[PDB]
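Milestone M4 deliverable, item 7.
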Amino acid sequence: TDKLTSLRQYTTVVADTGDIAAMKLYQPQDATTNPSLILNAAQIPEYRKLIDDAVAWAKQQSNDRAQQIVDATDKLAVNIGLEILKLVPGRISTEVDARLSYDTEASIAKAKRLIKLYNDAGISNDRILIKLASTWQGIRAAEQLEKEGINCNLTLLFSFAQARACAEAGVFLISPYVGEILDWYKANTDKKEYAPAEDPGVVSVSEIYQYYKEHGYETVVMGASFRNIGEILELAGCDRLTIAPTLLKELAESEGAIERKLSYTGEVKARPARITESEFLWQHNQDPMAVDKLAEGIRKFAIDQEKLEKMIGDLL
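Output delivered:
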């Protein structure tokens, strides 16, 4: 057998790409996009139809250039999601404009707007995850959105504070990061070689998974962002794992069954009082890796948003 097939016994496999070609090749349960992958996917010549559709659609909403840019960029990301939904039986994750990350009300509105576009194309909410950065503001947006029947994927999750607050908000899914935590440690410590079980992104996701199962939380744990297949196999058992095509290819080409690494066989323990905002801020900011990587990820995705708008502006 091969390591991809073996992994699927323990973990739901999700493809982290806007490339529909990968969905046919790997046949994942779900798919995830983010603003960088939408920008990359938007630049593939074969996707020009989706852009053109998005723009034509945008042009039939308003006569305002600034608004058309918004409508077209939203619609393009949803258009990509619809193509993926034709080829995957589960969820598509679509991420809000990252410039909204510290704004709860704007994030709630933007999530409702994307849900509306998806519903207008005949997709129910049970096939969509709206992706929001796991800042306090995004977590509060998610708590409200779930109550309104909108399922969320809380992403760029780096600190335990973030993990706990997402669990207590009752979010449908978390995407705790792995590879970018490895990046931070190599960059900020002497040690630049880790065995899989000591990879600090692996440690983080493993700890979060235990805290989640230990307290009976229903939020799905989906490890995300990988540097190597060693990291993935060390997280076999994770509810879901979203994996880039390059690493899906390496798993599929690797021979030999793997063991399940991540389990919780135990009692549902009682939950603490909920973390307050002040406690969350203290605790997140105790973690210098999370301080850096949350802020950075939001910055980079906002830049991708701006580039997408520059492309769309050039087509209006």
